[PDB]
């Protein structure tokens, strides 16, 4: 069962909008909204969305596998060896948020302070002592962006696996000699950095120039979660505030995906007339170029929705029913909708890109969609005995070597329940950089924004006040 | 009673090194080390120090007042009006960590997310609704460094007060017309930005070219906390690891201050021979130029300790007993002492500058000295009833207008106990940006690093593990 | 007769290599090499080439017209109005080296000091007094690259004409209102800057992603000058030094073009065996990325000449017969051929890009190909009476209003002999920026590098020494 | 006889303003204005000046010697060896415009294309073949500003000599070991780069914080050329246009120097009432911060001329009689005087800094003062036989080894007539970078701007039109 299997199972359920049913349903961890900072829903005047992996949740592992296959084909087409075509995507390997070390060709899972939690070279998981040879302080400077690339997005999942595949392949292929910073083939030297750049470029190519979009839209049922409750929730949002879309995708793709997401024989509820997807939004903005959008942005343009091309000129007019915008900035939205920062709840999956920047730069309130939570929660609950044992051992050790080896064993067994690279949120008792970012920048979070449907209009989401140690 | 009165009172006490006495003494909040992240003291191999406001704690309000007076005199000397000479420093106004808004001439206390907690224009505290005119979202983008300057250091305390004095002065002087971004005098317009730049430049001048250093060293008893336990603690550190000094100050000043700090008729303990301050350090580095020090740094030089001038040349040799270094980088220290990041406990007061950068860039463990805590703790404990009432009201309100007005009243009364700009750590129930930074980047903290004396060599400082909301 | 008609006429002639014939032939201005600084050919150890408009001279106006047509089609495809398809390239309008002013939408011909010589808005040539409204000092700051774009390359000829076409079109189309900085259409405003960016982007697209290359290679006879003397000259160069190619073009295109340039039923001379084009070069480098090439460059790669793809890895080996390189830097060439700067004569058409940078950054000697000279020389000689009259009038005026108006009339008539935007090198008696650059950075220049064939191996090209005014 | 001896001798002469006398006087090379580009004086509406080395010409070698002595004393005070105090300035060594190579510690005289004309290491003049070891192409990339510093100003003369002194000193002192990039003293290594930075910093210090200004103003007769014709010329300029001063110096220094320059018992002519120096200027601007002045500049301020301090505020008012400005930009001048670029003749000695930037950025016309010309002209005329022989030999050689050695000998003998580093304008038949810059950016030039006094109000300065080689 993948996380998108969980999301689709919940998607197939009709909405029971009886008060007591709703209260009961959001008791279950699976349908809850989780709260890092208190948020009075009654004060939200505008709800904003990203599209990809927010409204349009791509099915796993099918979509990652398609991305993987096309990226591989692109590398082969530009001259990588034919053996790449024997690779096959494996969803059990990658966890999101890993760091690729371009100097030494390792995938690293780190905490918020750059401490190494996991290190793999290809498919070889490197133990603590061996890690010290390349990482003397078991530490990386993560803002050294010339060296380290953080694979934080869901679109980075196939390249996460591909990087490890390529390191493994070149290591084990007798044509190549393994060196500390890459692979030697006579008078040719391929650095891990050059290899990484080729992979990144190929992923980019597949998304922007290749066939990924075309292959997705030709089989939307295979690739995209569809849920009759989406229009219901959006309709309810629109009763109490404004609704906007701000997506980096182009109009033609947006229109295809969104048309599919609303293609039911009814509107918001069963029995109601179907309405076009555009009718759910007070403002539609494509080609957003986030994160630049949250600063200077780009010139505001208007989409000719008949051709899918941009009209000639910067758009200087007012908000008009039926207009579709392109480019602009976050100020466009605030200006056109008459909203100030804290009046906006912005709903997205990009915890760097959108969520962090909207909060830091504009003071927007945030809702982070974490699709993997839909399955990670099932593991967390199923294996809570293991975590409880882990806490207990950390405690017993503190109050003072068999205990340390045991901590390592339990940490490993727990972690392997999630996959080879462990939980998105932790390795054993140590939180990941990703977890830290979610806590710091996501006011609310959940496996799906649809979970908002189960809380009433003016719900007050509550988090405990934080005290300093000297205050506690 | 100022915070430095508290520090000096504790400084006058002799050390009772009986095990049970030590355990008893560090029960008291005043002599405790507070813990944000667990730290096994037995693994620390090197203890590093800053000097100013760490080893050399300047007495309050005397030192701030001297800084203030010299800065005022400098402004008058470059052409500011004579009325400035009637100002007198008032320690009840400034709290550290305030943001000066150079557009509108306000001092702002903010939370970690840029939300406005307090706004003062001169000495006029601006209420919530009036704040919305200039801050529509009650929010500032704090990384807009062209507009906002964060007054985070103890050396910034006199300029914090001076800025408010100047805004008040120009506002009330009939020669000037108050405008939204500054003051008009016929054909001259003084922006708040230009005014701020003059103040900043004058503070810089007083420190580097003016008489501040000279006036301090001519009366060290008036200006600097002195504590016979300092050599005891440093001696004990040196029994179990290496000790270093890394200061931005020059050798001549360092030598004066440090000689004073060790000027007792004994060495580490009463009855022991006095030893020169230099003998307490395995490595002494001056002219450090932190924060640059934690990246590329500067060329490593050697001080001729007879003249106080630099020797000709970059120093290429090994660690030598008696050598004093100048410039270099954090890598110099690691290289010369054979330490890796986590093996170092770095002790300082600069929560941006040193503590943040040493942790983020180098993975050093950190101990933040917060001199104001020595008094803020006394207020916290004395007024805990008020805080408890505040929590209770926030709770009662949550579970559902007399309550809101009451929350405002209690918030005000609590805050005024600390000073006009409230606690360094909070306004009512909302934590400040400063508090957030301390929690994020200071592994340990206290009013004085001397509090380490009361914990045994291999003490394990413990903090509770952090859980995400979905994990809780 | 276009300049490429002149080049092709000379191209059809067989080489008479009799000593006296050669001496006679290079007397004619058309077959001469012109000399800005003395150059002893006997000291040149390496001859280097660009390809486009140097070895491969595209026929005029056919190639410009193709570029124009494809750029137009691209603009229409992205949403420009259908009326663009009625445009037709006119070689009588553009002269190379004009400046597009993105603020006011003018094409400007300037001198070396930014003084305005000619100003056209669309097809309206703006007289001196009217120019003062937008250019008060009849001066532009040409290094203000946010505002001004200098159209210095032969590939910029079609966009030079297209810019003027678009300004004319929008000005005269009643759907648009002409404004000082662009065109208003209700709630849309198209700035001249946005328009320019679209044109530049479209030209780029046509070259890199569109059908320009494909359409050129499918009819090389229509689009490319071919000359049996090219292999003769290259063969002679190789007898006395090394020969290299350094082109920004890719291997597949290079191979097509160069194969065509050498496709005769003979090698260097009639009667000799044909040899592959590659055999004429000691070093072949494609994907050069000039101008970056003359600094840090890019990683050195090797082309798999069977597939036209790059081999995996940076190339670390030595110069090998048959190897084709990609990327690298100018240092690659010097290193692999054992040459120092002044030992190299670098032959190209890009007077900024290559010629300027190779001279300034590397101290290479330079030969600038100026294809337009092949026709401009014919005008210069035919109309020398007009220029002589112009000089005489400037003289007579100096020694002291009928004379001034007469100077203007003769200037106009002379200039119109070259085209609507006048000579590449001057307007009347005032030299252009382009002329100044040629004099400053081209050691030698000619309409074709083939003119080197008419000078003996160790010819000493001589220019008069320059004296300062006080030395004269 | 120094160049300032020549200037002062001419300064002592009274002005004979008879028409025929003036025409006769400007026949002599010494009193001529030299012309690179034609300039109609009748079109100049504003005359602008720098002060230092333009209005206030410092006497040579006295002023250089004072600068030298103070710079030496500063280096010794910061820890350089006592032997530095035995150095004594020697005006026969430095020529202006030399390049210090911080890698190898050489002074280089170069042409406009970076070709080496002269290379000295300390006082050792390195022959051509030995130069190839460090400069394989006898070429430097002069815009590599991390490595090369061009000593183009008259204030750089003492440091030019000091650099060579220091290289010589360290080379010959047995305490130091000479290395390729600096000097080793055990565990200390002083790079030529570090040494250069110390010298540059010390020169800066002497000018801004040291006693240079004070020592100059206490003996203005020793240090500054004074000429009764200065007020006459300025008075005549003011009859036909506006006059401005734009100086980087501060008001207090400016006032001292200018008061001295006008301190005669008369005004413009003998017999006329003395007038304050300020009365000769329509606009006085100090603290100009050229070259930044010719772009964004700095905030416009007003000087309180009673205190010499700045008034509080940016100055927003109009041009007012008696006001003295500080900061601003070149646009300030144009705006306040109602002038456009070409209407301004800007008179200065900084051929980079002011003259180049005013021409390139603003289109101002330029007059370059070259104080050394007042003596270099005497050498040029006296030794014209040697130059003529040199030309003749270059000619005879061209038309075709005894000749080459002879060219070298004559080049040397000619060059030594000017000093050890030769003429400012050439080495033998090769022009220097400085000469090239003067020709390119100085419309007019002379040993003194006073030479303008000898041409009538509306004189047309004429230069021959430049022709390209193909046009000639």
Numbering used by the authors:
A (entry chain A), B (entry chain A), C (entry chain A), D (entry chain A): 3 to 402, 417 to 488
Task: Show the paper's wording.
Crystals of all three cN-II mutants belonged to the I222 space group with one molecule per asymmetric unit. Overall, the spatial arrangements of the mutants were almost identical to that of the wild type. The R367Q mutation is located in beta-strand 14 (amino acid residues 367–371) in the proximity of helix A, which is a crucial regulatory segment of cN-II.
Whole-exome sequencing studies have recently revealed that somatic missense mutations in the gene encoding cN-II (NT5C2) are associated with relapsed acute lymphoblastic leukemia (ALL).
